[PDB]
Amino acid sequence: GMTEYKLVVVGADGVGKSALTIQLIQNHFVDEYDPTIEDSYRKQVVIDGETCLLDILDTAGQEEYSAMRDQYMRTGEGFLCVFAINNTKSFEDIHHYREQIKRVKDSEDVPMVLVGNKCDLPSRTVDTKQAQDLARSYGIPFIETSAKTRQGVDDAFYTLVREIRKHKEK
Ligand SMILES: N#Cc1c(N)sc2c(F)ccc(-c3c(C(F)(F)F)cc4c(N5C[C@H]6CC[C@@H](C5)N6)nc(OC[C@@]56CCCN5C[C@H](F)C6)nc4c3F)c12
Ligand SMILES: Nc1nc2c(ncn2[C@@H]2O[C@H](COP(=O)(O)OP(=O)(O)O)[C@@H](O)[C@H]2O)c(=O)[nH]1
Ligand SMILES: [Mg+2]
């Protein structure tokens, strides 16, 4: 049998949620992917010897707080909270995404990873120290990624799976 892990990728428009997801799944950088499309993708992977199925929701569209949207998000087992290292506003939004996750999951202990994407770019407006401090304040890992080169991408998604696997053992 394969366990399926339901992962949700969230964060501001333009941070690279779609590029990270497509890079993970298909091993190619899709630049300029339609910002308005929300979809899910699956991949069979081996993580620490466990053959499992990732089901990844790449979020997009309108911010909305209906009971149905909350219930859909509540089915997520772990969340990648993504900002772009050259967009301070996307980093400032992270606290809001974490607050919504904690609210629908009714817990401060939700499997989560803070992802600083676009690390292939030389110009970084978000301080690495500030991002590490924010992740420490939430008790979650911080991983830098590039959806273009694939640097850190497997680590971000596999770390989130490891967190879900551990959470299910509590
Ligand atoms: N909804 C909703 C949610 C539930 N009902 S539950 C639940 C959860 F558990 C986790 C995450 C979310 C979630 C999502 C979801 F993941 F659902 F797609 C999309 C958001 C979204 N999108 C709109 C745009 C930007 C990215 C993409 C999706 N297109 N934007 C914002 O905030 C945007 C800002 C700027 C303007 C005012 N707001 C408050 C802060 F200032 C930040 N939050 C979003 C969000 F929290 C939700
Ligand atoms: N250089 C660089 N550009 C990226 C990276 N990830 C995404 N982009 C670009 O950033 C823009 C937004 O990416 P997208 O995946 O659409 O972001 P989303 O709105 O969060 O889904 C696009 O023009 C991408 O090609 C990355 O790691 N490096
Ligand atoms: Mg997208």
Q: What is the beta-strand fraction?
A: 15-25%
Using the coordinates above, name the CATH class: Alpha Beta
CATH topology: Rossmann fold
The distinct bound ligands, ions and cofactors come out as: the ligand N#Cc1c(N)sc2c(F)ccc(-c3c(C(F)(F)F)cc4c(N5C[C@H]6CC[C@@H](C5)N6)nc(OC[C@@]56CCCN5C[C@H](F)C6)nc4c3F)c12, guanosine-5'-diphosphate, magnesium ion
Q: Helix/strand/pairing class, anyone? A: alpha/beta
CATH-level-4 superfamily name: P-loop containing nucleotide triphosphate hydrolases
Topology order in helix (H) and strand (E) letters: EHEEHEHHEHEH
Query: What's the arrangement of strands in the largest beta sheet?
Result: 2-3-1-4-5-6
Number of domains: 1
Rg for CA atoms: 15 Å
Helical region count? 6
**Overall geometric form:** globular
Largest sheet: 6 strands, mixed
Instruction: State the end-to-end CA separation.
Output: 22 Å
In the CATH hierarchy, the architecture is 3-Layer(aba) Sandwich
Describe this structure in words.
The chain is α/β, with parallel strands linked by helices and 170 residues long. It has one domain: 3-Layer(aba) Sandwich (Rossmann fold). The protein is built from six helices and six strands, in the order E-H-E-E-H-E-H-H-E-H-E-H. A six-stranded mixed β-sheet has the order 2-3-1-4-5-6, with helices on both faces. Strand 2 and strand 3 form a beta hairpin. Bound molecules: the ligand N#Cc1c(N)sc2c(F)ccc(-c3c(C(F)(F)F)cc4c(N5C[C@H]6CC[C@@H](C5)N6)nc(OC[C@@]56CCCN5C[C@H](F)C6)nc4c3F)c12, guanosine-5'-diphosphate (GDP) and magnesium ion. The site of magnesium ion (MG) has 6 residues, from helix 1.
